[PDB]
């Protein structure tokens, strides 16, 4: 395995999907 | 395994660390 940001729990991964939206914020403003 | 956001490549993981800073942007403004 190279590298991975683990989460642990269903809701946990999902939480990271929204966390990715926030990333977009930077790429935006 | 629950879930994980894989990357693939050293620089690749690192890139995601900066990607996490961008996340902070949302939690900020």
CB atoms within 10 A of CB B1: 7
**Way it was determined:** NMR
Please report the number of interchain residue pairs, chain A to chain B, with beta-carbon separation below 8 angstroms.
62
Determine the residue among B23, B27, B28 to mutate to test chain A binding: the one whose Cβ has the most chain A Cβ atoms within 10 Å.
Answer: B23
Q: DSSP letters of chain B?
A: ---EEE--SHHHHHHHHHHHHHHHHHHH-
Please give the DSSP secondary-structure letter assigned to residue A6. Answer: E
Q: Considering its fold, how many domains does chain A have in total?
A: 1
Enumerate residues 1 to 29 of chain A having a beta carbon within 8 A of any beta carbon in chain B: 2-10, 12-13, 16, 19, 21-23, 25-27, 29
Buried residues in B9-25 as b, exposed as e (16+ CB within 10 A): eeeebeebeebeebbeb
Token pair of B8, please? 């693939």
Question: In chain A, which residue's Cα lies nearest the Cα of B27?
Answer: A22
Provide the domain limits for residue A21.
1-29
């Amino acid at each position: 395995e190279y590298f991975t940001l683990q989460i642990r729990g269903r809701e946990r991964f999902e939480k990271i999907r929204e966390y990715n939206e926030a990333l977009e914020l930077k790429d935006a403003q």
